[PDB]
Every structure is written in C-alpha cells, then in structure tokens.
C-alpha cells in the first residue's frame, strides 16, 4: 500500500518520567514506523531493551539524535536516509553522544548498514567507548560534500570488544561484523559520467538525478528513495503539472497524470480543509496579495482587489516561531484578528511568566482581545485558563477550526487541565480536521451532551472527552442543558448556551 | 551523568525537573509522565 | 557572447519573387543565426550565388529543408543538430529535394560534416544528381532508432564527377574532399556501457546522457549540444521552475536561480520582443488563451479576462492552419474573437469562393464579426474589399498589430488595391513592428495625413503610401480632414475619425 | 521537370500558371508578377 508514517520527537535530551516511561513512550512513537515525519530521538534506553522495532524505520526527514543510550545495540538496519529537514544544535543532521553507562560500558553495536545519503546538514560522534566499527566508515558518500567542513567526528573506544571488518568490506569500512555489514558505496565510487547515485563503477550503472539513497536500475522508478517529491511509483522534481502548453495548439492542453502538491507527495486531490492553488499545490496559507475563500466547496486563493485584510499569524511560525504561548509579550498582536493563520497556544507558563524567556505575566484581561476571532487555521490548545473563569469566554465567538497543522499531529482542539465549568463555544460550528480530546478539566460539566459528530469535515475525526466531571456529578448538582433547549446539547448551563 | 541543577533553573521545566548533563553542560529536563517537549510543556495527547 | 537566434520560416516550396527577391529574403532571415527556433528553409537559390552565410548556423528546433536549388555548394558545415519540433510531410526533420538544374547541373556538395544528431524525424533524399560524397553516410549514427523505416533515400550519381572520400573517414564515409568532411561517428561504435552517444570507442569515452550530438568530456556539462535543455553551461532535463512547493512548509517559495524557458535553453529574463508565460515558458506571440500585458516592467500573457471576451488564433494556423484567408466557411469561428493569435489574411478567393476547397462567396455582411477583434499578434493584409463599403468598419475597434509574423517577415499592416476611401481605422494607436504599406487604392484619401511616428514602436520602421488618390484631387472634391482636426491627422472625412 | 497540371487542377492557380512536378509528384504555381503564395493569391 503505502508507506506506515510518525510523527516524530523534538525533545533533545529531555528524559519523559521514568527509563521505563521514556522508553514506552518512545515504542508507542515508533513501533512500525517507516518514515519519520519530524527527528527520530533515541534516548536514555537501557541495558537489555529490545528495540527491534525500529527495524521497519526507512528515512527520518528531520535529524536523528542516539544520546545517553547504555543498550548494547540499535538496530537501525533499513535506515536508507536522513534528509536533515532540521537540524541538531544549528549544524548536524546525525548526532550520536555519550551512549555509555557509569561502568564505561554501552552502545556497541549500531548496524546502519543502509545509512546511505544524507541530503543536508553534518554529523557529530562524541564519547561512545563501546561502539564498534562505525570509525571505518568513508562519511564522504554519505554526506554531502558541502557539509564536510562542518563534521565533528572522533571515535575513542577502550572496551575493545569490537570485531574487523569483513575482508570483502572495501577500504576497511562496515558497520558491522558480517560482509552484510560491510558499506555499501552509491556515490564516490561512481563513473565520471553520473551526476547522481550509482550501481557500480561502470558508466551503465548511473541512477536517475531524482534516486537519493541509489538505485537498482536506471529510470525514475528505479530509486530506492525520492530525492523530493514521490510521485506513485516514482521519484520527481516536480509534481507533473495540471496543464502543458501546446505548441501547435497553441493553447493550454490538460494533463492525465498532472497531480497535486501535497507534502513530499504528488496526490489526485488535495484535502477539503487545504488551500489549493491554481497552478495546482495544496498550501496552508495564502501569499501576499491572494487572499483565501473557496469557488466552490474547495478553498482557493485569489488576490486582494485592493492591499489585503491584516493576517494574524500563529503561535509557532513567523515571528512567534518559538514562542510557547499567547504571552503578556505578544498578545497585542492579535488585537482585532478576526483570523488565525496558524495555531493557538494558552498554556501555564502564560499566567505565571516566565523569566528565562523574559516574559512577564499576562493580565487575564489582556485575552478578551481574542473575541474577534472567528477562525482558526491550525489547532487550539489550550491547557491553562484564568483560574476565576468558568468557561472559555474569549473564544464565545470562534466558529470554524481547519485543522491543516494538528498538535502531536493528531488533534485540532485540546482543551485539558482547567477549573472551568463549561466550554462555552456556542459559535462553533465546524472542525474540519484532526481529532478532539477535553479530559482533566475536573469541574466541566455538558461536554458530552454536544454531537461532536456534527462539526467534523474528514472521515476519521474521533473524540476524546474523559476525566471531566463525570456525569452523575453533573447531573447532581444542577449541570444539565436547559429545559427550553431539549434536543442537541448545550455549551453551558443557560438558555444561550445550548445548541442551534 | 546526570547531575542536580542549580536552583536558579527552578522555573525552567513546566512539568518536570531539571536536570544537568555533563558532557552535554547544558540544563534538560525530566518531565513527569503524561507531558513532553524540552521544557515539558506540552500535555501528550492519547488516542 | 550569447547565441544569435532566428525564427526560421514556414514557406516550404513557395517562392517569394523572383531568385534575386528570394535569394535577398533568405539571406537577412539567416544572417548570422546560430540556432534557429523554427525551421530552416532553403530554395531555389541559383548557381553563382554564395550561400556562406549559412556557415554560421549550429542547431534547428524544426526541420531543415533544401529542395529546387541549382546553386554548386551549401555549406551548412557547423549543423549539428536538428531537432525535430516539426515535420515537412508529417515525416521528415532533414527532406532535400530534386536539387537539380534543368540541363542536369545542380547540388554538387553539401558538406555538413558536425551534423552528428536528429533526435525526431526521419530523412529523403530525391532527385540530387550531381551531388556525390553524400552516398557514403550511415544514419543509424544520426537519426533516432525509432525512425529508421520511415527514412527514404535514393542516390544517383551521372557522371562521377565527384571525388574519392579520403580514407581516414571511416569505411570511406565523409560529406567533401578533404579530412575536414570525414564523417564523425559518436554513437554506433560506443561501448556497450554507454547509455548514448560517445566520443569514442572506450567506456571512458562515454557522453553524459543529457548530452546530444556528443561530448568533449565525461561531465553533463561537456556536451556539444544538449538534449533537452541547457541551463548556462550544464545540459539538464527542464529548467528550474521559478517557485516551489516546499515540503514542510505547504507553501510556495520564490525559488532563486529558477529560470524561463527559451527555445533549448533556460534563461532569468525574457530576451527582448519575447514576454514570459505563468507556466514558465518564454514566447514571443501570446498564442495561449491568455493575451499579453506589461506587469512589474515585463510582459505578462495573461489570461482572456476582463478586457478579452476571447481570443482566436489567425489564418493558416491550427484551426485554420491551410486557409488561404479569411472565408465564408471559417469567419463564423472568428465570433466574439477579441484578439487574434497571428495574422488575418483577406483575398479576392474570400468574395469570389473556391470550389477546390468547397468554399462558397463570402457574404460581405459576415466581415462585422470582426469588429471584436481588438489586437492582431501578427499582420493584417487587406487585399480585397466589398467595393460599396467605404471604409474598413469592421476593425473601427482594432487597436494595436503586434507585427510578429511580417508578411514575407517584413510588413505588418497592408491595404491594397481596394476602392475605399477612407480607411477608417480609427481606434489603431499602436503598430509595434513592420513595415505599412497601403497601395492601390485609387479612391483613398486621409492616408497621408497620419503621423505614423506615433503609431510605430521600433527603429527603422518605414512607410510606403503610394498610388492612392492625390492629395490635391481630394482637397478639390473637398475630402479632407475635418477642420477640428489638426497636426495628427485623420482616419476619414469625419470628426469621430479625427486623430 | 515540368510536367502539365491536370484538368482536375484547372482552377488551382490564383494568380499563376500550374505545373506539374514529377520529382515531388504534385502541383505548384508559377506566380504571375506582383504575386505570390502557394497558389500565388498573395501581393508583393
Ligand atoms: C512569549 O512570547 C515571546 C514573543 O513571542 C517569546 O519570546 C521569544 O523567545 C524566544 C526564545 O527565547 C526567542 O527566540 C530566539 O530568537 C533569537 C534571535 O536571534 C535566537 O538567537 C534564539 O536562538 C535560539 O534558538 C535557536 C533555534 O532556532 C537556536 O539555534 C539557538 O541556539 C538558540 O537556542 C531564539 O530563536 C524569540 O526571539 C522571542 N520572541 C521575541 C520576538 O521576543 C516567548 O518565548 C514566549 N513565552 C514563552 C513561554 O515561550
Ligand atoms: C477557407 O477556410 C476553410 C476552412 O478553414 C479552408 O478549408 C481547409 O482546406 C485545407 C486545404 O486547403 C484542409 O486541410 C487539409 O486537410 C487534409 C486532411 O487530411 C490534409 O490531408 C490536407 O493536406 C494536403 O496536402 C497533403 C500533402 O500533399 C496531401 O496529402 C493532402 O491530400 C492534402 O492535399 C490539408 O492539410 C482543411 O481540412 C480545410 N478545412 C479546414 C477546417 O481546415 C480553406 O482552404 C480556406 N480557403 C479557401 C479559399 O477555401
Ligand atoms: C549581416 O550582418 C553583417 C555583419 O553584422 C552585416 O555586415 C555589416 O554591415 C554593417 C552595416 O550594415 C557594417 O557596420 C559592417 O561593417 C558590416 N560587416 C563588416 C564585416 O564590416 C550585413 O550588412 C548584414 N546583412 C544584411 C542583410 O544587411
Ligand atoms: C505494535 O503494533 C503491532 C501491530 O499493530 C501490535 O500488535 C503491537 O502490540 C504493538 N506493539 C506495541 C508495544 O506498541
Ligand atoms: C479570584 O477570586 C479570588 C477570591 O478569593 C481572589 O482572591 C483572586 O484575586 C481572584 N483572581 C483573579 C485573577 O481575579
Ligand atoms: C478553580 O476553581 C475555583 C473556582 O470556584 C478557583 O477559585 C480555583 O482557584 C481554581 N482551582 C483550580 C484547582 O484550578
Ligand atoms: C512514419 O513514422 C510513424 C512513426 O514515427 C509510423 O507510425 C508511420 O507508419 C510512418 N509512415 C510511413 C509512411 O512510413
């Protein structure tokens, strides 16, 4: 079919509970995963652990960081490519640090035997007595030749219970013990007429310009990885176009294989909730003058008549790149937005301050300048609320939520951890995409009486609405619906609050 | 390996401890389970 | 230290005048010119008439034709490649045809020596008696595998009078006399390991498989000519497109060091008198559906909306791409045509029919389907007329002629022999290139008044008005420009015809 | 050379005399002066 996707982790060396709770976690993240979508983190696994799931992991698109491991061995084995879509620490693409125990004994063995390009980025291997055999490896293949410079490599191991390479291994360079292990080379060792990856040393045996790993014939189709876009069974620069130009013609002549623009992907369609454009991409945003509205049920982008209407970019990209939270800091830049271009973020941290980002506290009063908002592009996530509210007054007015970027990639509305009483979105209407969990908001009270069904575009969306107060509670103290509204559901306790 | 950081940190992690990695000299943190992210800001959200 | 480059023609087997006329027009076409967008087509050139300026040529998009020659020697030595774009016959990317005289003299040498690659078409030689050292060529090494049957070639000789190939060619192969015309092979003796051509026997000698004709090393970059497109120095498959689609933004990123599209080549701004399409192609004529404008200091081919309820391509073009003009049958598709992607060619055949065609008369009344018709990309020729219409009304609307296409690659606008009065042009402000001229017309009048500088958009744009009415004849009847109007002349006896 | 156009072709030429050519096995037309075209139905 296609192939198996998650989502990856950004959290560096940060320890998630326990060695026990980590390493779940990590399982839970990875457990048949092909391609990483975000940086595959290896951390803290312990002595004797199995991590034979990580055999089905084929390419990461961000980086891949094995730090702080003392198990014996990371089987890595179909790992083909790191494509370095972001990097560790501003430089690496391939961080391997301090796998050892307070013995000196640790990481031995880590077999990335189909470790064979990476398109951007250098590498850094740092106090790993235990390894064995990566110091042969010729990084001149896999890396590019533009990041030489930058790579920080010394390998210093006293254990020594490293084995030699295979004598078949060429130059002395595997990753292992078995002639399996021994490198393959795609690159250094190619005839002078390949541009690309190759098969072998003679000039037949060039791979297509758009192979990233190599390949195991000459055409397109014959890639082991896409350098850029996957296009069915095929690697391409571009994504076929809508329309070619005819000469003769003299007019613009349809495609059949013209396809969309959706990721690393070529697709028949883009999805409802993502912008499509006229030359044929699917986008999250419009650019510059265009402004977003849909011609007919697909939401298309078209210029502003006149200069366009103030957009309000959100918490995570653009200037609020790494901001954590609407702060004290940078709530005045969403005055009178009537439109969130991104996503919104309310956590703890906002009400307290928070010193090592030099934000001080926000006046809850402050939030009152988000009743403008209508609409929200991404995701709201809210964990933290004004203590002295009971519901989420300044989002009384939000009516549609587009889910194009989704928290954990999973959920476009998480509301978790408040002492509200009620939601409170009566204007909601719509949640286009991506999933829905309210749970540990101990005193909400009429979560489960809306029909979550009713507002969502896309066949999977799923609830989760747990460990509120439960129902008997509600039910006891007066928290139902109103009696005037019956039917549907209510977002709180009044008249107004009740559905349609 | 891991090392007890200095107070001054105290307020770094927003679900968690910090923590102090040697070779790395730079602070990190253990996030009680159920969060995650570098400073553990972030509720892991479950099925 | 760019290329030159020409449009090529389309006339195939028409003469334009006489030798001299014909000689003269192939000649300024061909000066020069080092790859030639259209096709290269050579006729009737006369024995004594030197043909050197075709040495100069390198590459040909379309198809090269050399038929009717009498003259001695065609030295199209550096043509390397002929692409292929288009056919003569449907069939042929090189057709060189009964280049004979009658006394039996004729195309004696034709040494081209670099041409090393057709990728589409095959090949005809008919009726060249007195050309000889051709015989000894194998194709397979020029023209594409796929095309080796429809290639058909005869070769004759009379009188031997040709010499031996020199033996350093290959089995006694070679275009002239000398080394210099032996026949170079950069395909069929190529190893096994080669994916396509070679500059020699040894896998070493293997060309990068974007190179074309051949290499003079191992790099895609050392290509002779590229195959499908070369970017400033390295042959590639497209040019880079001027945006992209970013993966893990979902957005469009402006994509420095994308280019256009010109001819077999990818370059960062249109060459001049050729505008930029939104798909990345760079034209000259904005055939797409779209219609042409200057947006941000470049012209923009942008789509028929607002001012254009449609666009129409012109005569002897797809729709009517063998209509000898504009005629009862196919005038109906010219409705609501705002613009015309080419040229308009009115003839006497349109009001007298043509049965060899089916074609009945032309009933004047449909000429009013023009008056849409705003914008000309090519030139229009008026050769006939409906004698009691007085001026030309139907294009009271046409504003600007692109001049493009040149009648003969050299006019752009064009009345003669009509028996109007007044032209009546009266919404035309602009003629971008050509020549005008406006002949015949023993009735008009108000055509010396215009002050054509204005009008006109290049150099050495000339005017020929001639043979019309006298100015003084007109001026005693009392035709003349109103007296409202001024310096700038008049279209025709009334104020709304007023410049 | 030049061989007759046919009676078929009697109303081919605009503005020229037909011949025939036996080498490209079709009809052309000498343009009578001043003009030209494939059927000579072109001014100069
Ligand atoms: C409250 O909102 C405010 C504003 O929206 C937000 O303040 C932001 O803090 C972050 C982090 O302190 C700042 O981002 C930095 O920008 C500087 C500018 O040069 C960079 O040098 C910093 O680089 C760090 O991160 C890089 C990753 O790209 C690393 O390469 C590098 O090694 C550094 O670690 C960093 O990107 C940002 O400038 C401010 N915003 C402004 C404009 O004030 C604050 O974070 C929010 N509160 C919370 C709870 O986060
Ligand atoms: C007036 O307008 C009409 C319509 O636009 C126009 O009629 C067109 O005539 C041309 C020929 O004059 C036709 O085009 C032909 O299409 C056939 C279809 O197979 C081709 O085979 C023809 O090729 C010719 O030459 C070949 C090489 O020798 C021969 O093998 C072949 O037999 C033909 O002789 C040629 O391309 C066209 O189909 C019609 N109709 C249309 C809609 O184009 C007319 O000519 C215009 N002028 C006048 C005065 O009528
Ligand atoms: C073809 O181009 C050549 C060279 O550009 C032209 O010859 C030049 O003519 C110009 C003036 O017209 C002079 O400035 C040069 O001195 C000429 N060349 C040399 C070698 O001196 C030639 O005129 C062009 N042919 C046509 C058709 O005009
Ligand atoms: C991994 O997924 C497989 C197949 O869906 C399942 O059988 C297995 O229980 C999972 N393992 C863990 C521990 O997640
Ligand atoms: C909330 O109400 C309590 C009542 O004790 C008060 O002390 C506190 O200051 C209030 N907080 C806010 C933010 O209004
Ligand atoms: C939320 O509930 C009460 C309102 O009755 C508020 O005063 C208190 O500070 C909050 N408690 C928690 C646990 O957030
Ligand atoms: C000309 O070539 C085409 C394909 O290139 C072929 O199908 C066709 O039969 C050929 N025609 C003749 C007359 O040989």
Redesign the interface.
């Known amino acids: 079919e296609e192939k198996k996707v998650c989502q990856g982790t950004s959290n560096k060396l940060t320890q998630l509970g326990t060695f026990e709770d980590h390493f779940l976690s990590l399982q839970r993240m990875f457990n048949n995963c092909e391609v990483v979508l975000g940086n595959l983190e290896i951390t803290y696994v312990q002595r004797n652990y199995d991590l034979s799931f990580l055999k089905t992991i084929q390419e990461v698109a961000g980086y891949v960081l094995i730090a702080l491991n003392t198990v014996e061995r990371i089987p890595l084995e179909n790992l083909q490519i790191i494509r370095g879509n972001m990097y560790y620490e501003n430089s690496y693409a391939l961080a391997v640090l301090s796998n050892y125990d307070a013995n000196k004994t640790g990481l031995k063995e880590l077999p990335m035997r189909n470790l064979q390009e990476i398109l951007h980025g250098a590498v850094r291997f740092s106090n790993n007595p235990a390894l064995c055999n990566v110091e042969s490896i010729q990084w001149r293949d896999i890396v590019s030749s533009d990041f030489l410079s930058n790579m920080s490599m010394d390998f210093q191991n006293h254990l020594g219970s490293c084995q030699k390479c295979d004598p078949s291994c060429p130059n002395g360079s595997c990753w292992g013990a078995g002639e399996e292990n021994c490198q393959k080379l795609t690159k250094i060792i190619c005839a002078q007429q390949c541009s690309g990856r190759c098969r072998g040393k003679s000039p037949s045996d060039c791979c297509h310009n758009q192979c990233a790993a190599g390949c195991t014939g000459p055409r397109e189709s014959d890639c082991l990885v896409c350098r850029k876009f996957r296009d069915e069974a095929t690697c391409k620069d571009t994504c076929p176009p809508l329309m070619l130009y005819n000469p003769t013609t003299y007019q613009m002549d349809v495609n059949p294989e013209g396809k969309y623009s959706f990721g690393a992907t070529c697709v028949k369609k883009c999805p409802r909730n993502y912008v499509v454009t006229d030359h044929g991409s699917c986008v999250r945003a419009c650019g510059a003058d265009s402004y977003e509205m849909e011609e007919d049920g697909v939401r298309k982008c078209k210029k502003c008549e006149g200069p366009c209407r103030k957009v309000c970019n959100g918490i995570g990209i653009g200037e609020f790149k790494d901001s954590l939270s609407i702060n004290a800091t940078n709530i005045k830049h969403f005055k009178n937005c009537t439109s969130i271009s991104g996503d919104l973020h309310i956590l703890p941290v906002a009400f307290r301050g928070d010193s090592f980002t030099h934000t001080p506290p926000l006046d809850p009063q402050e939030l009152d300048i988000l009743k403008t908002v209508k609409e929200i592009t991404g995701f709201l996530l809210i964990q933290a609320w004004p203590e002295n509210r009971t519901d989420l007054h300044a989002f009384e007015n939000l009516e549609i939520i587009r889910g194009r970027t989704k928290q954990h990639g999973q959920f476009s509305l998480a509301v978790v951890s408040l002492n509200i009483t009620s939601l409170g979105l009566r204007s909601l209407k719509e949640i286009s995409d991506g999933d829905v969990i309210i749970s540990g908001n101990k005193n909400l009270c009429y979560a489960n009486t809306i029909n979550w069904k009713k507002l969502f575009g896309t066949s999977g969306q799923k609830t989760k609405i747990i460990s509120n107060r439960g129902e008997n509670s509600c039910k006891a103290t007066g928290q139902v619906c109103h009696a005037l509204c019956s039917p549907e559901g209510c977002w709180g306790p009044e008249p107004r609050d009740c559905v349609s | ?1 891991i090392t007890k950081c200095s107070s001054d940190m105290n ?2 992690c ?1 679900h ?1 401890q910090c ?1 102090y ?1 040697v ?2 000299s ?1 602070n ?6 159920g ?13």
């Not at chain 2, 969060?35 to 099925?47: I, K």
């Open positions: 390996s307020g770094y927003l968690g923590i990695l070779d790395m730079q990190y943190c253990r996030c009680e389970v969060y995650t992210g570098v400073r553990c800001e972030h509720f892991f959200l479950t099925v």
